[PDB]
Amino acid sequence: DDLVGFKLFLPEGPCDHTVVKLQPGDMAAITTKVLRVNGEKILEDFSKRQQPKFKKDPPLAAVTTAVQELLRLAQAHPAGPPTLDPVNDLQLKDMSVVE
């Protein structure tokens, strides 16, 4: 169950958020889904809210929408949606990678 695709994590608690500075290697996959969310407004929400006194601001729509969409994406695929295949989605033809 862990070796077929990418095991879709289902959070055991309430659907919170974090905004992390990820490396390319910390990312398991580049998903096929296209969620037209605005990164700028999410920065204007995470960086704005992360004042310890203002961490309790009412949520902005871009962050709540992104978090809800991510959780729905986790539920909406039984074991993980197909990734943008290196060969069959990025239009490559190297035999070694196909094999």
Curated annotation (Swiss-Prot):
Transmembrane segments: none annotated. Coiled coil: none annotated. It is found in: Nucleus; Cytoplasm. Component of the SKI complex which consists of SKIC2, SKIC3 and SKIC8. Interacts with HBS1L isoform 2. Belongs to the helicase family. SKI2 subfamily. It is linked to Trichohepatoenteric syndrome 2: A syndrome characterized by intrauterine growth retardation, severe diarrhea in infancy requiring total parenteral nutrition, facial dysmorphism, immunodeficiency, and hair abnormalities, mostly trichorrhexis nodosa. Hepatic involvement contributes to the poor prognosis of affected patients. Helicase component of the SKI complex, a multiprotein complex that assists the RNA-degrading exosome during the mRNA decay and quality-control pathways. The SKI complex catalyzes mRNA extraction from 80S ribosomal complexes in the 3'-5' direction and channels mRNA to the cytosolic exosome for degradation. SKI-mediated extraction of mRNA from stalled ribosomes allow binding of the Pelota-HBS1L complex and subsequent ribosome disassembly by ABCE1 for ribosome recycling. In the nucleus, the SKI complex associates with transcriptionally active genes in a manner dependent on PAF1 complex (PAF1C). This is Superkiller complex protein 2. It comes from Homo sapiens (Human). The chain holds residues 899 to 997 of 1246 of the full protein.
